[PDB]
Amino acid sequence: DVSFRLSGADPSSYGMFIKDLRNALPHTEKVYNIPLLLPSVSGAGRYLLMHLFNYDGNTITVAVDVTNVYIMGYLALTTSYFFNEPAADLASQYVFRSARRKITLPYSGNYERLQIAAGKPREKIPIGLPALDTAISTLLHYDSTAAAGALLVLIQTTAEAARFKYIEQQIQERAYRDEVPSSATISLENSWSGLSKQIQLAQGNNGVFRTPTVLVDSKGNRVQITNVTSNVVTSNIQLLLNTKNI
Numbered sequence: 001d002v003s004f005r006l007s008g009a010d011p012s013s014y015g016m017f018i019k020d021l022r023n024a025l026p027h028t029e030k031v032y033n034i035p036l037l038l039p040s041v042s043g044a045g046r047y048l049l050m051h052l053f054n055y056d057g058n059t060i061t062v063a064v065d066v067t068n069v070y071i072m073g074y075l076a077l078t079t080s081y082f083f084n085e086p087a088a089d090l091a092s093q094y095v096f097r098s099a100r101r102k103i104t105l106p107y108s109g110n111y112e113r114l115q116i117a118a119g120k121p122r123e124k125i126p127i128g129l130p131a132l133d134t135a136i137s138t139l140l141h142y143d144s145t146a147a148a149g150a151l152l153v154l155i156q157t158t159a160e161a162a163r164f165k166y167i168e169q170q171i172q173e174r175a176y177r178d179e180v181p182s183s184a185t186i187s188l189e190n191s192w193s194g195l196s197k198q199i200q201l202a203q204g205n206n207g208v209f210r211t212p213t214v215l216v217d218s219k220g221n222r223v224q225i226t227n228v229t230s231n232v233v234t235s236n237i238q239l240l241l242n243t244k245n246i
């Protein structure tokens with residue numbers, strides 16, 4: 001398991017937790033030096049448990065699918081909560097079985113279903129460590145509407161941060177003050193799948209992408225990614241979604 005506590009948390013411990021989060025996911029091959037996520041894992045081992053503690057010390061345990069880094073659900077005291085999606089339902093057969101009751105959310109974990117449930121896009125939802133403390137707090141007590149938004153904060157603080165160093169960096173700048181995500185952040189989140197595909201396809205195309213990826217950069221400008229020499233591939237992306245899942 002991996003853990004993070006917001007009490008006493010700073011850019012340092014956050015980075016360490018994100019480093020752990022990354023190291024917890026297994027892989028057998030690296031593509032252009034980037035861990036390649038497995039096509040699939042069978043049974044309970046398919047899920048990674050993250051113990052998160054808010055500033056007061058309360059905790060929720062989040063189950064993550066180690067093949068894609070998708071959040072399946074979490075445990076709040078003695079109640080389990082899982083998205084309304086096949087994968088999560090499957091996940092419920094293995095994790096938090098001893099919870100006293102199981103609640104299925106009214107939506108899947110997809111960014112689009114989450115934004116609807118929440119009544120606003122990620123664009124306008126401030127993130128950072130403080131925001132992650134709010135999120136943990138919200139999920140301790142069931143509220144599907146407040147949860148959608150806390151869940152959008154959680155996904156980005158943790159899964160997207162493991163996925164991209166840049167996003168991990170974005171969150172460390174927000175260690176003591178939340179801020180809506182830069183568009184480069186939303187761009188990267190939206191492009192993880194495609195970038196993972198083209199990184200793997202480049203492998204026998206001499207590091208050239210079969211199809212270029214369009215991103216938005218730091219300065220907020222439209223940019224094309226055509227091959228593995230881009231900083232995005234050399235520095236940024238830290239985990240790759242196996243094409244066997246794309």
Ligand SMILES: *[C@@H]1O[C@H](CO)[C@@H](OC2O[C@H](CO)[C@@H](O)[C@H](O)[C@H]2NC(C)=O)[C@H](O)[C@H]1NC(C)=O
Binds near residue numbers: 208226
């Ligand atoms: C792969 O991607 C490279 C940049 O990420 C790109 O190099 C450049 O493209 C032109 C030069 O002809 C410039 O617009 C740009 O400044 C160049 N970037 C750098 C840092 O040199 C390669 O040309 C791309 N290769 C392929 C096969 O498309």
Ligand SMILES: OC[C@H]1O[C@@H](O[C@H]2[C@H](O)[C@@H](O)[C@H](O)O[C@@H]2CO)[C@H](O)[C@@H](O)[C@H]1O
Binds near residue numbers: 071109
């Ligand atoms: O949308 C980002 C979000 O991914 C969720 O999974 C989605 C997925 O993007 C889509 O291909 C599919 O049709 O719905 C999936 C779940 O039902 C994750 O659960 C989440 O953790 C985010 O990364």
